[model samples]
Target: KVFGRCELAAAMKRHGLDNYRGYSLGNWVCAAKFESNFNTQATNRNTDGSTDYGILQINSRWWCNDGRTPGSRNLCNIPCSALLSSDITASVNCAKKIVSDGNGMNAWVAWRNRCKGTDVQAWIRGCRL
Candidate 1:
């Protein structure tokens, strides 16, 4: 719960967010907004019997392990609690890797269902890093 929209944008910008795979900072920001409301510690359960972890709601089914969450492939090799840290570094890094794996922001259903096809420029407003 360390970042609001503005700080998150700056964080993403510092991490090469602008035009990364053609997805805008706004896309990332907007997705993070709807997905977790900027709460990095956010966790949710999937109907598919998997759990979502942290800021980007990365799935325990393939990304992180929270112990209580079963069937974790732990592809990111990170403990789910790591993504809950006040430091967004690990979360951002994992997200970028997800995008590189061809999911893009589409890896985040919040983006495809809420942020995509929408004008999200305001998410980046006043974010100067």
Candidate 2:
């Protein structure tokens, strides 16, 4: 599903991403918006041959094993397809792992380019959650 802004906020919150690290709900929502525009099946293949999958765009090389990435770490230990579920639970869990692994949200170039130190409150302004 391509979620609306507020809908994405509510969905991520329900999956326990709100302040999962030190990052705020707005940060997560902002990153996801810029990363995939809240599209569950979004994907992009890097020049290095790793593909980023799903709303949070977890990478095949380190997070999800797509069998295409050589020596994939597969730290999330799930198929890359798992990240594409409209339910978003796996994406949220994998994203939490990414943040905890010391990259924080900056692991995503989209977040670094668009959300870092920015006033992201507008992303969640109308969300009740």
Candidate 3:
């Protein structure tokens, strides 16, 4: 599913990412914008041949099992396909897990290069949350 900026913001907030681990809803919104452009079906092949999946671009190498990533840890203990669902529940949960696992939002390079430490308030400007 393709989500609008505010729509994605509200979804993330509803799923408990607002100020989660010291990162605001704006931070998540900005990360999504750069990671997958709010597209749930988005996937990108990494240099190591692992793939990123879904809205937050969860990596097959470390997060979800794609059945092909060498030495895949599947830390989220879910199939990579689960992250592609439009529902985003699994993706959100995996993201929370990733953040809580000591990596924080720095797990996503998109967030590191684009969303971190920026004034991302505009990303969630019209969202109620």
Candidate 4:
């Protein structure tokens, strides 16, 4: 199964990035591929026992402070579990927002330049999308 329950098409739609190359799904997918191989349920433990959960690999201890309650104050108060509980489209949209402040592709481009170059970053730079 794809990382999130939402289809790639639907996730693009939810994020207002249905334009594909124009929106940076290519880049995001690249990062996802490298991070968790697009596995939504993937989880990893840090040395401290904190966890990186879900498709986007949100760190529960860092991002969710609601104590596993649905609404916690972790990492700007965004629910860590929401990354998994929500649809893939919603998760992608949320991740896009968290990454780009609603700028979508531009944010993605910025991420590519700022963050280390991943396959997606190279694709985005090459495509100039």
Maximum-lDDT candidate: 3
Instruction: For model 2, name the residue pairs that clash.
Output: none
Q: Write the per-residue lDDT of candidate 1 for residues 7-126, one digit (tens) a residue.
A: 889888988877888888899889888888888888898876778777788888888877866677888889888988878888888887788987677888888999888888978877
Clashes of 2: 0
List the candidates ranked by TM-score, beginning with the highest: 2, 3, 1, 4
Model 2 regions lying over 4 Å from their true place = none
Query: TM-scores, in order shown?
Result: 0.90, 0.96, 0.96, 0.56
List model 4 lDDT by residue over 2-90, tens digit each: 64423443454456653444544556655555556667767776665566666666555546443643433365356655666546654
CA displacement after TM-score superposition, residue 58 of candidate 2 (Å): 0.7
What's every prediction's RMSD, in angstroms? Answer: 1.6, 0.9, 0.9, 6.7
Q: Rate the local accuracy (lDDT) of all candidates.
A: 0.83, 0.90, 0.92, 0.52
Model 4 poorest ten-residue lDDT run: 120-129
lDDT for model 4 = 0.52
Give the Å error, residue 110, model 1: 1.0
Q: What is candidate 2's lDDT per residue for 24-61, written digit by digit as tens?
A: 89999999999998899999999878999999988999
In angstroms, give how far residue 122 of model 4 lies from its true place: 9.3
Error of 2 at 32 (Å): 0.5
- Each model's number of backbone clashes? 0, 0, 0, 3
